[PDB]
Amino acid sequence: AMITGGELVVRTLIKAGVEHLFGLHGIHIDTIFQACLDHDVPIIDTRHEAAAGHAAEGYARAGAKLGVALVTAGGGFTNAVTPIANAWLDRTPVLFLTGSGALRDDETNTLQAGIDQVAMAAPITKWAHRVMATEHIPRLVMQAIRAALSAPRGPVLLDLPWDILMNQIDEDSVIIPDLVLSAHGARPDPADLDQALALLRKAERPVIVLGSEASRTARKTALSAFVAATGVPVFADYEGLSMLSGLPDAMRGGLVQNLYSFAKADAAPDLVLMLGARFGLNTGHGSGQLIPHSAQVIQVDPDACELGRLQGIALGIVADVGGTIEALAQATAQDAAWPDRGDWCAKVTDLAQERYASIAAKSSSEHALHPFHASQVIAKHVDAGVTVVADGGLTYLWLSEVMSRVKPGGFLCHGYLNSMGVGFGTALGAQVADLEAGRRTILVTGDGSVGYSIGEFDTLVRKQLPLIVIIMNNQSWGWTLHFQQLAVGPNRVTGTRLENGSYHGVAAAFGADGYHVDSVESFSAALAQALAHNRPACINVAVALDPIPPEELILIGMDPFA
Amino acid sequence: AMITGGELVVRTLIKAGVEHLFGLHGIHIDTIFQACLDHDVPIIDTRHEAAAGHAAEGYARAGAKLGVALVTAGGGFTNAVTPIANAWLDRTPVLFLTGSGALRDDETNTLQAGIDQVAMAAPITKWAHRVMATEHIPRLVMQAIRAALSAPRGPVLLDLPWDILMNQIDEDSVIIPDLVLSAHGARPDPADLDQALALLRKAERPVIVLGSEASRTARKTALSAFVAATGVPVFADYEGLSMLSGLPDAMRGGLVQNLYSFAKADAAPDLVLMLGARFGLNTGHGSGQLIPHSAQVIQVDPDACELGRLQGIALGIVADVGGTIEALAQATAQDAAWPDRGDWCAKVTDLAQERYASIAAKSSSEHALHPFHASQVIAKHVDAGVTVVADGGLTYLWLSEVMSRVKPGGFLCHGYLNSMGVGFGTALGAQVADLEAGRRTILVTGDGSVGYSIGEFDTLVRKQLPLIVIIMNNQSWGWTLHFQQLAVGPNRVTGTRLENGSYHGVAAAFGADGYHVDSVESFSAALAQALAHNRPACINVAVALDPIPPEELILIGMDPFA
Amino acid sequence: AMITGGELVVRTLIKAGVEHLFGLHGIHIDTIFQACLDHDVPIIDTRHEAAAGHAAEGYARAGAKLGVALVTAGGGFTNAVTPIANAWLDRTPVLFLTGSGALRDDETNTLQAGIDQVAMAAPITKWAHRVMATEHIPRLVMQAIRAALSAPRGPVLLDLPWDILMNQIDEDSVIIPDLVLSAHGARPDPADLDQALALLRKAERPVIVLGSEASRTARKTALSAFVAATGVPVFADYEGLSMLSGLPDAMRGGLVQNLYSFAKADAAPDLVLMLGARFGLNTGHGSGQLIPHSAQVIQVDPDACELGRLQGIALGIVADVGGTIEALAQATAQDAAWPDRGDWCAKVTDLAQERYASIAAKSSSEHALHPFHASQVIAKHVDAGVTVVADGGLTYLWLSEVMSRVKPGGFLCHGYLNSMGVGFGTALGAQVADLEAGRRTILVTGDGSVGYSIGEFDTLVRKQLPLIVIIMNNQSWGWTLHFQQLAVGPNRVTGTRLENGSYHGVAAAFGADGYHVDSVESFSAALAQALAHNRPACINVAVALDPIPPEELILIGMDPFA
Numbered sequence A, B, C: 001a002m003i004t005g006g007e008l009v010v011r012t013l014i015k016a017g018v019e020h021l022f023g024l025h026g027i028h029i030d031t032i033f034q035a036c037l038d039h040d041v042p043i044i045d046t047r048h049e050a051a052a053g054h055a056a057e058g059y060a061r062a063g064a065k066l067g068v069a070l071v072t073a074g075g076g077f078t079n080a081v082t083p084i085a086n087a088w089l090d091r092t093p094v095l096f097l098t099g100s101g102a103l104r105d106d107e108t109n110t111l112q113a114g115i116d117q118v119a120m121a122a123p124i125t126k127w128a129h130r131v132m133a134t135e136h137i138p139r140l141v142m143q144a145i146r147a148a149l150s151a152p153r154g155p156v157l158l159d160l161p162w163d164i165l166m167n168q169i170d171e172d173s174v175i176i177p178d179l180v181l182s183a184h185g186a187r188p189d190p191a192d193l194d195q196a197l198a199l200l201r202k203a204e205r206p207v208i209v210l211g212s213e214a215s216r217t218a219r220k221t222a223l224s225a226f227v228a229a230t231g232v233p234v235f236a237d238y239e240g241l242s243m244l245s246g247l248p249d250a251m252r253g254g255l256v257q258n259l260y261s262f263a264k265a266d267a268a269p270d271l272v273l274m275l276g277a278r279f280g281l282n283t284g285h286g287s288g289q290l291i292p293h294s295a296q297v298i299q300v301d302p303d304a305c306e307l308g309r310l311q312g313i314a315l316g317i318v319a320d321v322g323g324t325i326e327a328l329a330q331a332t333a334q335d336a337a338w339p340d341r342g343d344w345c346a347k348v349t350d351l352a353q354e355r356y357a358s359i360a361a362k363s364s365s366e367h368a369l370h371p372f373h374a375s376q377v378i379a380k381h382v383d384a385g386v387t388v389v390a391d392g393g394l395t396y397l398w399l400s401e402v403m404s405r406v407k408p409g410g411f412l413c414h415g416y417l418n419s420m421g422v423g424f425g426t427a428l429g430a431q432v433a434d435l436e437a438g439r440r441t442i443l444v445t446g447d448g449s450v451g452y453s454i455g456e457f458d459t460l461v462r463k464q465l466p467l468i469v470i471i472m473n474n475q476s477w478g479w480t481l482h483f484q485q486l487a488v489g490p491n492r493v494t495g496t497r498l499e500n501g502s503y504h505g506v507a508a509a510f511g512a513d514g515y516h517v518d519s520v521e522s523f524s525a526a527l528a529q530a531l532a533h534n535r536p537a538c539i540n541v542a543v544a545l546d547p548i549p550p551e552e553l554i555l556i557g558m559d560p561f562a
């Protein structure tokens, strides 16, 4: 028959293995909407394009697969910029399909047309391109997919002029190709794999730090066989945590942010193995905090820029992180000459424990519900059947203190962009990935960050998504209000207080469950209540503002343990 | 004494004459926040950076001045992109002040940093530029203002590294320089102005069409001098309508879209003078449905691409629209012999009025409130004491049909980008520019577009803004659903129905007045009620889905009077 | 019949009045070649696309019209970058027509395809754009011409995919539109015009400075009437010098660079009138050496960025420079009472003349011909019938000192880009424009610079172009060798000597008249010889290296006088 370019897009995505798209409708991309309707593909349609974009991210992260986002021309695309920017830095594999002006209505001042979407998207994407001919649609779509999913994973834009989409050709003119890209990643040269193992055996205090790319390939069975052979502790940046949930408990060092007072302990790691973790913000930069200059560092990253960009390393290998762990278990299933790491692993869990006691010792929840305490109520329900998504300022800095101790099904936190509010978006789409697994999603967000996408309680309800939103309400933009007294001066705070409005009143008005809580018990009663029930909820949690997280004081450059 | 890069900016904006900024606080730009506090200059902080940017647009357009927008690094900037794009196409003079990563922490994977902000805004701005030394700030800020304000007016982006903002210097070492740019625009060469007036005299059915740029300089008394002398009617595209409000009633033609039904009456304009109107969406592209190919066209635009871009004109002048009007009055003051236009002007008002009676005659509001009947209820409250702001899909297309009859102090509608939801931001900042002038602002929005910025009721209450928001709620993304049922098929509707949620409840949750009305009486009661009170209000108006606005059928290329 | 997209281009250029192209043939752009050959418009085909690009600049600047460059896809476009860049900063109206890959051969790794040609040209052009439809060619080309030719004049890039160019439509289906854009530019307000004149009347030591845009619009008759009425002296940067050749000699201040030693004379100008000169390289920046801080500045520029960008000004008008000179003569036709400026005019020509003898006084041509003495030889032939083109390092810094006194038909020197070797290109194109005027072109280049485009002697020969090329050969990259010893150290000069080659031998091996000269008499004799002959000539002049252009010392910030 004769199908439209819109249909050609959809066949190609179905051929890849795509089963959900997140989007918001426009006349310009309606041919895709029509084709999805025809091929029984869900198109979760949100209230803001950005929220749909982040929804694709969360699906991609929580799902360990490709996320797809669909936005209309002009305003559709520009509303989509923040999720693209976010997925760019988080290294999140998301295909962004956008409509634009008709080729033939080029340069005529028509509606939603005239802005250079690929130009805009270029410095934010692994690849961005505008389709010039309908026959190109199947192969350009697959190309776009391949680029996003290969290492390092990242966001890709495909600009589908209205003109090309509506247009129609003969089904036989064109070939819908398969996704013919191996699921297995590239492995290091046998020469280096041996040198890195030789180094790890000589190590007295060795550690491994997992990055985002450990989670995208998700090679758990091979990682377990490897830790089970060498017996070395394992840390991760935020994205990496999901991986540490198949590991014995003494071999779990937790969040990379623990390796801080390992110096002040005369116990600083002897060697560091970085698999996908970059010398960015999550690893304490080139400063030496979490990773020590003295230490001999082995860094694996598909992207050779990252190889000792900030510190000098000892060995740097270009390869896929997931494909590397496979090559690691394989070469460690004959060794058997691996030292006992008891005394080392012992202190690792000890130092993490001291921090947990040191914060619980500082926590007074006498007058207003301390935030470190509230996070514990949440900790109580976190296991492999629960994806946790974090947003807000101080509120996610408090969760990190409680997150090393539990074993989550997914954990999705801020990337280098650190854009407040992308929480709803990411969380929503996370739940759609979690529906298959039976996992349930919980968003822990700030009173500020919820305001960005508050309308999404509508989408939650319309699409029947049982996401629980916990709003840690301190009646302010938390992180910034602290900066104002702590970096500027006590009496002068502006543009940061948010002392107005029932967020729970909003959610109830949008059709979701309202809960209001201020005490520890009030909160635990409500969280267990919302979890028991199988529909969307909002919990407005009154927390103190004054308390200063240890992580806030690390990042400006001070010791919270001195 | 010693100053910081932030202070330098604030002093430079004050020497320009700026009295409000719209922003959203982040630590990267806190320096400006602090300097503003010192100088009693208000920063209206919203819930989303987008809403802030659009608020600067609304400030600018309704204020006939520069609108200033301030956003933080990274997510702060990318969230502000929809406002920049809109400002670009609307030709709206807005200065966009963005923070970025520190210069000394360049290329290190730090926080909110690594996205090429200037590159991203390049295709959307008259000028984009990242500041490289703290002493450059005062002259780089002024150069940005001049860039923004010169014709054609447009957005300008100025990236201030955090490094450079926090950074510190001597008061007398650098110079806060003055705003030296003449307010009066450039005039056509007299030989061309004479060609034009000669042409205008010989015309049998002459019209004038105003664009954005007429409203920007706002030379009202020079238009009245010119119309009341040649006696020619005057039309305007959306941005230009504000300018027709101090004009004699007979020589007002209304919105440029009334020139449709002018052919079928053998009364198509003989000559068309276009002052800032571009050929494109507002003026019926190159089709000659509005501007007939037969007519002698005279076009005046600051930007030369624009001159006869889609049609052939007889005269194309590069000049300021504002200054061209001044010359049009100048050259008309001695000229005694202008023909009588009484019969033609009678014909213009006659054709426009037949249109109105034709719509009312086809409008039943018995089963559910007709969107037209609803639009009339609003129009009876519109005079020069009111700025009406429009958003949504079908809802604004209906409102246009009543807007030609009333003389508004401001009318801010969709530009070419047609981004749904920009209504809140613009409407908010419009109310800020309106407070000083004493005028009151109404936003007339659809049920879809309001969901975009619905947390902004928070800003409406925190900041004490008596903005009334009418939601024309047809429980669907109206305009796209009409495309789906009319051009694809009645049973093929997906992703456009919005069958959920109390919007008036949402406003009531943030502390605004809630109204839910459905009949003509109820709504008029509700509107008059909210207007009496100096308070932020939300009117949720239940309106019909089925009716097709005459503009929907015109823009698709059909006759709606057939 | 049916014509080609190539034909559609040529028909449109023809309607603009384009009578010559500069280019270099590729198969992608052959349809334009066929259409030019069909319609007898000459395409001057050079040996390098950069020479073709620059030749178009010279044609534009020397003919005071639009210039058109035509380069093929890929290498054709990239070779064209330096001319586009130069035209951008010189403000030169140049249409760049480029081929690119076939739309339907998109992303297929083909011949000459794949490089984002509009992206690369975006920051270098007023407008860069890829043509998307064969129907579009006529209106897009004219839109391009309008954008290049509007104030401020600058280069435009039009990308014409080979696919769309080969395409064939029906003649009658598309309309080849006229150039309807008034040749007179916009004039200043009459409030401001009068303020400037009253300020000019109150002035005690007023001066006028013409910049690039004065030569573009070329409003000579209006300038003669204006200086001859107020009697104020008049300077110019390099581009502006051509206009000073229709002026009584005492009223000629010459090159703007004379106003240097005017301060230490207590003769620093009271008031400065800037017509299109920008605060920058030619005008001693924001430093106030040439354009004093004490003095009141009145600045007129099409681009408002420029208005007091580096100094504070007293008045700043957005207007076309050509139009402003008109308005000025106009307003001076009634103004009978302009004071006598005899005392000031005399002082001016006196100081410029003293500086001149000050250099001849310190010049010795005994052991090798002095570069200034050599410059004087050339000055003896410069009149209204000669276009002089300068290139090279020291060699042109020497001419400037001799150039103020003589009144040339054209004078084309380096723009802000200051790119060596662009001489042949610009000069060759200059000679083509000069054929209509009867003027002859003479290029003064250095030994390093001729080296860039040396093969162009071949184009001079094949194409019968009697351009005379004087090489001031000091067997080195002069300017950089001087920086090395004068700012770095005596004994450390590397990579700057060019002690090799017969340049005259090269020109003769290509077909042109070869001359070798080292003394004053040899040089004057041969220069006079090649001029009598109506052929292309090369003159290789051995000049001294050790000398030091006063300008070379006026730019590090030091003083070549007191």
Ligand SMILES: Cc1ncc(C[n+]2csc(CCOP(=O)(O)OP(=O)(O)O)c2C)c(N)n1
Binding pocket: A391, A392, A393, A394, A395, A418, A419, A420, A421, A445, A446, A447, A448, A449, A450, A472, A474, A476, A477, A478, A479, A480, B024, B025, B026, B027, B072, B074, B075, B076, B079
């Ligand atoms: C998109 C974006 N990202 C980051 C910032 C800067 N920022 C970092 S933390 C913060 C306050 C967040 O408040 P909230 O979400 O309530 O969390 P809290 O720290 O108050 O608990 C802001 C404004 C910003 N202004 N915009």
Ligand SMILES: Cc1ncc(C[n+]2csc(CCOP(=O)(O)OP(=O)(O)O)c2C)c(N)n1
Binding pocket: A024, A025, A026, A027, A072, A075, A076, A079, A112, B391, B392, B393, B394, B395, B396, B418, B419, B420, B421, B445, B446, B447, B448, B449, B450, B472, B474, B476, B477, B478, B479, B480
């Ligand atoms: C930012 C943006 N997103 C999506 C669209 C596509 N679109 C055009 S009209 C329309 C429906 C608008 O709905 P609503 O605000 O309720 O107005 P109404 O239903 O009354 O027409 C949509 C989704 C758009 N033009 N801009």
Ligand SMILES: Cc1ncc(C[n+]2csc(CCOP(=O)(O)OP(=O)(O)O)c2C)c(N)n1
Binding pocket: C391, C392, C393, C394, C395, C418, C419, C420, C421, C445, C446, C447, C448, C449, C450, C472, C474, C476, C477, C478, C479, C480
């Ligand atoms: C395109 C380009 N422009 C400028 C320079 C830097 N530069 C400025 S002057 C100069 C020497 C010019 O030598 P020549 O052409 O012989 O003139 P001379 O001063 O030696 O007489 C150089 C290399 C450069 N390397 N490349």
Ligand SMILES: [Mg+2]
Binding pocket: A392, A446, A447, A448, A472, A473, A474, A475, A476, A477, A478
């Ligand atoms: Mg908070």
Ligand SMILES: [Mg+2]
Binding pocket: B392, B395, B446, B447, B448, B472, B473, B474, B475, B476, B477, B478
């Ligand atoms: Mg609606």
Ligand SMILES: [Mg+2]
Binding pocket: C392, C393, C446, C447, C448, C472, C473, C474, C475, C476, C477, C478
């Ligand atoms: Mg030389």
